[PDB]
Design an enzyme around this catalytic site. Structure first.
Site, PDB file in Angstrom:
ATOM      1  N   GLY A 196      -1.300 -13.193   9.476  1.00  0.00           N
ATOM      2  CA  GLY A 196      -0.453 -12.183   9.360  1.00  0.00           C
ATOM      3  C   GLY A 196      -0.381 -11.284  10.264  1.00  0.00           C
ATOM      4  N   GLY A 197      -0.746 -11.427  11.629  1.00  0.00           N
ATOM      5  CA  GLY A 197      -0.771 -10.701  12.575  1.00  0.00           C
ATOM      6  C   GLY A 197       0.420 -10.119  13.394  1.00  0.00           C
ATOM      7  N   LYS A 253      -4.741  -7.338   8.265  1.00  0.00           N
ATOM      8  CA  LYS A 253      -4.735  -5.944   8.131  1.00  0.00           C
ATOM      9  C   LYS A 253      -3.301  -6.081   7.491  1.00  0.00           C
ATOM     10  CE  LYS A 253      -3.157  -2.006  11.195  1.00  0.00           C
ATOM     11  NZ  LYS A 253      -2.214  -1.795  10.098  1.00  0.00           N
ATOM     12  N   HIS A 257      -2.283  -5.832   0.606  1.00  0.00           N
ATOM     13  CA  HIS A 257      -1.746  -4.901  -0.236  1.00  0.00           C
ATOM     14  C   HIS A 257      -0.159  -5.380  -0.439  1.00  0.00           C
ATOM     15  CE1 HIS A 257      -0.969  -3.421   3.668  1.00  0.00           C
ATOM     16  NE2 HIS A 257       0.034  -2.893   3.688  1.00  0.00           N
ATOM     17  N   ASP A 258       0.420  -6.309   0.183  1.00  0.00           N
ATOM     18  CA  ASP A 258       1.658  -7.060   0.120  1.00  0.00           C
ATOM     19  C   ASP A 258       1.763  -7.858  -1.048  1.00  0.00           C
ATOM     20  OD1 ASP A 258       2.523  -5.698   2.329  1.00  0.00           O
ATOM     21  OD2 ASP A 258       2.730  -7.807   3.463  1.00  0.00           O
ATOM     22  N   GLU A 285      -7.342  -2.258   5.240  1.00  0.00           N
ATOM     23  CA  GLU A 285      -6.498  -1.806   4.300  1.00  0.00           C
ATOM     24  C   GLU A 285      -6.683  -0.323   3.912  1.00  0.00           C
ATOM     25  OE1 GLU A 285      -4.107  -3.748   2.639  1.00  0.00           O
ATOM     26  OE2 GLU A 285      -4.431  -5.436   3.381  1.00  0.00           O
ATOM     27  N   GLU A 317      -1.818  -1.041  -3.672  1.00  0.00           N
ATOM     28  CA  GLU A 317      -3.062  -0.437  -3.125  1.00  0.00           C
ATOM     29  C   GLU A 317      -4.040  -0.918  -4.185  1.00  0.00           C
ATOM     30  OE1 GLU A 317      -2.889   0.137  -0.262  1.00  0.00           O
ATOM     31  OE2 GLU A 317      -0.825  -0.018  -0.047  1.00  0.00           O
TER      32      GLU A 317
END
Ligand SMILES: Nc1ncnc2c1ncn2[C@@H]1O[C@H](CSCC[C@H](N)C(=O)O)[C@@H](O)[C@H]1O
Ligand SMILES: Nc1ncnc2c1ncn2[C@@H]1O[C@H](CSCC[C@H](N)C(=O)O)[C@@H](O)[C@H]1O
Ligand SMILES: COc1cc(/C=C/CO)ccc1O
Ligand SMILES: COc1cc(/C=C/CO)ccc1O
Lengths: 352, 349
Positions: A196-197, A253, A257-258, A285, A317
């Site tokens: 997911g960069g 990164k 949290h998604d 995170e 979070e």
């Protein structure tokens, strides 16, 4: 008497969207770059001189700018001073406040401005109108507004896709620059992968720092399509819940949290599978503080929880212990808090 | 004091920028909480309540309702909108909730917030850049007509706008009436742009042998409740103003340019007898953009006017007297003050 003070606070809350939107306008207009560029240090300029550098003829633009700049000055987004004319007419002038350093392009040409544009985007405001329903009916507010999840939707709205990836890219550069001067976890790796960069800014920074290292920047095809070529960076379109490319280490990164814990398990298991025996997941995170304290650092993480609540595929979070629990849940045997930059902690889930 | 720049000074600046980026989270979260009646539920129960306990009072079919509530409340708590204690987080109302829950006469500022955070009023911000660069008003660029015109065609937003104003004015006027004495004496009072007539009805309740005229545009007078001693009249204030012993304008000047205000005030002067007065209830611009809450409220509202109104802005005491004089009035007084709302008198002394 202080009932007065509650009333006013109430009024201020009501119209509180004015600050971001107003600032959004000022940035779109390039009215901070214009200040950085023309101004003596510790000096400030007038709305009239600012308006002169805009592509406009609108006798009103100076006045409108002054009114905007005033609001930002009352919140310390810009500095100010008052100059009284003999008649008693007061002219306002404005300068750069410490936050401007991060809202105007730095050496390197980077700021947090694109990120502000992302977070104030018209597309992201719609979801708020659906939060009430989501609390009653179940579902996700973004999904109720548009016909799909955020990332799918990014694959349909090409404007928001560019705004999102630039927003993410700008933010991450500023931060990775700092992580890269304190954290040493990328030492003695041959292959790094960024799951997911995004458009591969983080990966390009890792390679620029360790030329020996082979990066793989991994994300959805609609993101990868828009990725610049980077020396040392292989781009790969894919889906992380279907698997993840193989490397000594993996970097995530702003990914956990998604998603729901159940989604992070799946991702994390995919990461475990993709790693050698002594490999690891480097997790970047925010970490949730133990209470609703009034500090900027905390309002930021808490703001983002709320973001996540409105745009979520079950994002949230998390505390340190919660992250530890995600690491354990997915077969990791060690856990390390290795550093922190601008509320982003760098954790290692080790498979030792 | 000079601060050298270090990691600490920079980290704070980075975090402040992030906080600005997403600052809209607060009023949208707050909105959602008022929409669910979350504050009112709290107002009437246990003095701390868990998200679970609130959710059990909501018509929900969502097992994650409590968790979702906790996340919204934690954000409110963070800003002192709500208070908390720890076991889990249990939540209590903060002093501000005194004015965000239907408290006494069934009134709060909740409906104003619902007006301010409403889709219709948010759209115009995406047009601000345009207006500045190209000329015009952000609102007109969004909707093809001015804001009062738009209310006349959107029934939903008309009710939401009138309610917001009515419940805001109701709180403030109550304080004005305890404080300010200029309504005493008058036999006829006219409220120009009085809206739904809340203020006029308040004036007559207090002074039952007063005749009140509530004056506003036809489309708003049509939604105006019958009141003892209040005559509702629909018209355009720029063509002229009903005759009275005194004229009241609360939150009118600030909607318009100097030119527009000069016509109004001239109409008012002509509608008055030789010793008549215009009673003007407006904020007044402080001298600096200081960080206090009071000043932010008026500055917020100055910027709101930028987005939505034809040439409307906030003004200094002096600019008000200037409008007073430019309009025939020979005398000028700042009479009293409630919740940063000054009552000025333009006198034909
Ligand atoms: N199923 C999936 N597979 C791969 N990438 C995904 C995904 N779902 C979301 N993403 C990507 O996850 C990112 C979340 S934002 C993270 C950007 C951050 N600076 C970073 O580079 O890590 C977006 O770039 C999105 O395209
Ligand atoms: N040309 C005009 N003639 C009469 N009323 C007008 C007008 N233009 C706007 N208005 C009204 O002015 C009001 C501004 S909002 C102010 C309401 C306030 N509480 C009060 O009593 O004054 C709205 O009610 C709007 O309908
Ligand atoms: C959970 O919902 C999401 C929201 C965003 C928005 C980021 C802008 O601040 C990005 C990714 C997500 O998955
Ligand atoms: C919708 O237009 C108006 C709004 C306000 C306050 C709006 C939100 O705080 C005040 C006067 C207006 O004419």
């Amino acid at each position: 008497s202080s009932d007065e003070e509650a009333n006013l606070f109430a009024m201020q809350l009501a119209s509180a969207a004015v600050l971001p939107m107003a600032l959004k306008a000022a940035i779109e207009l390039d009215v901070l770059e214009i200040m950085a560029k023309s101004v003596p240090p510790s000096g400030y300029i007038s709305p009239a001189e600012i308006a002169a550098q805009l592509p406009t003829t609108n006798p009103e633009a100076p006045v409108m700018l002054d009114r905007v700049l005033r609001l930002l000055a009352s919140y310390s987004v810009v500095t100010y001073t008052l100059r009284e004319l003999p008649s008693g007419k007061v002219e306002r002038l404005y300068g750069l406040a410490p936050v401007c350093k991060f809202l105007t392009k730095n050496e390197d040409g980077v700021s947090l401005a694109p990120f502000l544009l992302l977070a104030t985007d018209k597309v992201l405001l719609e979801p708020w109108f659906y939060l009430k329903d989501a609390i009653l009916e179940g579902g996700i507010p973004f999904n109720k507004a548009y016909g799909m999840n955020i990332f799918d939707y990014h694959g349909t709205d090409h404007r928001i896709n560019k705004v999102f990836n630039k927003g993410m890219s700008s933010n991450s550069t500023i931060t990775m620059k700092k992580i890269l001067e304190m954290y040493n976890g990328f030492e003695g790796l041959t292959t790094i992968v960024d799951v997911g960069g995004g458009t591969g800014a983080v990966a390009s920074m890792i390679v620029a720092k360790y030329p020996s290292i082979n990066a793989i920047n991994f994300d959805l095809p609609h993101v990868i399509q828009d990725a610049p070529a980077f020396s040392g960076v292989e781009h790969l379109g894919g889906d992380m819940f279907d698997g993840v490319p193989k490397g000594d280490a993996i970097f995530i990164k702003w990914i956990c949290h998604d998603w729901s814990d159940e989604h992070c398990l799946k991702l994390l298991k995919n990461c475990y599978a993709a790693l050698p025996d002594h490999g690891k997941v480097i997790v970047a995170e925010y970490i949730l503080p133990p209470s609703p304290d009034p500090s900027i650092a905390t309002k930021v993480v808490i703001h983002t929880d709320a973001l996540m609540l409105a745009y979520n595929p079950g994002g949230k979070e998390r505390t340190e212990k919660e992250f530890q629990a995600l690491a354990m849940a997915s077969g990791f045997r060690g856990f390390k808090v290795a550093s922190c930059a601008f509320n982003t902690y760098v954790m290692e889930f080790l498979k030792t």
